[PDB]
Amino acid sequence: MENGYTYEDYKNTAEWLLSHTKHRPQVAIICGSGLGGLTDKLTQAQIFDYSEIPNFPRSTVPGHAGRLVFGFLNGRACVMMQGRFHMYEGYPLWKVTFPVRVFHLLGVDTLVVTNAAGGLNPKFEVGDIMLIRDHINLPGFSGQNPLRGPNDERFGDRFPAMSDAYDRTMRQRALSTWKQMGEQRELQEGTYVMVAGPSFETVAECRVLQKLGADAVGMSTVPEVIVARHCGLRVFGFSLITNKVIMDYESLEKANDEEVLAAGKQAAQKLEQFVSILMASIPLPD
């Protein structure tokens, strides 16, 4: 196997961009669920469709979406992906994570990723948001790691570490940032596990994941994080718990995608603003 992209394809995509917009972003954001809004919270908004951008993964089947939106979020220069790629759609991971490498070349130095995810910790509840303190990359154990293949020294090392992937500073700020707006639910913290999907977990599987010590489960994110870290970026992210994963044979409920888009609307602005004020914590460039 081999990454389809050549070092220089990344550079070409970046420069293109570096010259079709005045913006120079510092924070990349990958939503999410609605986030929805954040496109409005932005200001100075300049949109591109993925389809216009050299090399950008070709999202394949319409529906899709596919806008890079650059602008300013709470006094930070931002670029946000509305719609992402997933392994379950058929993309090899070096396509799923291509944007991340573009972002680093645009000058970006922090990455914020968010997602919807099923709650595995029985303590959680629908609507909680969970801060990501660590992950379990199950696909990665078997081979599906977006770094598989020859390493490009210009991006990072052959064997990078992930033990510190979720910036401790940013996690503190966020827990602080959240109490100083006081809320009826606390900010949650824990381990995200990625599985590949696209079908949802059985009860026994859900039990496996709890045993492994996962608190939440979803189908993305982890690869983008690994590539972000390989690159140098500072990374921080979290999960809107959109559903309690099932957990015993009694219950007559199942997990669906109605509930995920629905819930994504309950917290539509809860997060819209969370992320937005979070911006003020993220350091600045020298």
Next chain:
Amino acid sequence: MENGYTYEDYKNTAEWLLSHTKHRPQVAIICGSGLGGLTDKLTQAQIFDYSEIPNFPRSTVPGHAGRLVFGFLNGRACVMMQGRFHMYEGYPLWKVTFPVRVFHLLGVDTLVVTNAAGGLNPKFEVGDIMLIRDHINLPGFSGQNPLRGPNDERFGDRFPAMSDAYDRTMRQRALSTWKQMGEQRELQEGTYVMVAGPSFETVAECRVLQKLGADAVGMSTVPEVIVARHCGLRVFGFSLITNKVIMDYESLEKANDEEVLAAGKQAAQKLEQFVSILMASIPLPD
């Protein structure tokens, strides 16, 4: 990655069939181990080789077999696969599970799958049959899920649920159906875990699988079930425990395929008739 088959390839395979046999099956059965017999228990039997059928995965290396057999089993219209495809043979999962999609288009609305499997629960013994109440789809965690790729809305949703994959009704009937023939061994019930093979588990691996809460382990089935569910079918199945998986370093025994084909002959008719009377439980069409 991409499914090699186009929506219309399925339709073409079905129609072909829908016109080379008078039968219209309602129950698909995928054996199994011998089952062997069931070809005889059938009546009105019309055979096809896979090799004659448009698009049917090309089983590759002779030995193989490869007969679709249509007919009547205990007053149900049935179609049965004698010999199946496996991931360990090299087939992508969208080939392994192609027949299942054909069956749905033939009008079939229930699927019965069976297999041989190693016992992980120490309580089980060689010869038991285990009813499948749930699965752990380890390949699926990493990417090897037969639904990976663009979803075809005409078959099912993008994110289907598997928490209820093994029809509770059918499981009751079967446990009942079995006591009303009274036996010296009970019907067993539990979790099937799929691993990809083709080599057999080490002791440490066997220990991993017990810890995860699996009761039996084999190399198939799960994908066909996921595709069956994605499609609407009612699904029910089980495992002939052909061997006790090893479990500690003391023992001087290993797992082989002699014992699997051998044992498959001990229960040759035990199941031959089990499945056969089971037919009478499965509802009917309106």
Next chain:
Amino acid sequence: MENGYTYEDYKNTAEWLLSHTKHRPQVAIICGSGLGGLTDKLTQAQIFDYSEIPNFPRSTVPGHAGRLVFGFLNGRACVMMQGRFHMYEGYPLWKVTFPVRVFHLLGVDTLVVTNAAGGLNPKFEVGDIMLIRDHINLPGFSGQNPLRGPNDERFGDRFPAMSDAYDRTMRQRALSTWKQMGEQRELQEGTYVMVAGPSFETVAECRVLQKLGADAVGMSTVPEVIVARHCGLRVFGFSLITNKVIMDYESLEKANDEEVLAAGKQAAQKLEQFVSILMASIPLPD
């Protein structure tokens, strides 16, 4: 999927070799870490680069290395791979394990493999060497098993067993061989788990692996062992624990590849000689 090599490609590579060197090895050794030295400990040393050898996986990117070195180690006819292939580099497993099949055709009947690996057992310490008593083949669970595809009856069975992969005799000799040179650290024994890499584990992942009962973790070896066993070879191996895998969020240390090459030099000769005297235990040919 399909193995790229044809039965006869193996034969062609072997014969070539069987006629460009006088040596006829009995023991294949796959290092390792430095082992470094063993090239010197050899005598009668005849080197080939992989690049000169028909069919030998093309190591792709220079740096690489790539010497088969034949000769005599402590009165055994040996062939040793300096540098190996890994799944994380992009090679399909049927390339990673190609040499092993060549070795069997050269007449070789034992295989010794060694590697660097992170310690998961808290009892271990940097510098220990761990004897491999068993493995957990996580990639194998999902599909990445070097035997996937049509089986070639001339090498081995379709469904071979791995429960006895690590020769009990050889393990005894080694534990004995080691006490009769008395040391301040004991020889360690346990389970090696393979993960695919190339990035290092998170804390949560490390915790998963302990729970599964792994004592050490690395990114290779297991596939070569499975192919060795499929073939008939006697197999024995171990791990230089080059680093203690991290294990809790407190610690401010990470895993790197400095430490792995460094430590590989601490034990440079500790193992250089261990393997070397080990030679005297391995039986002989009739």
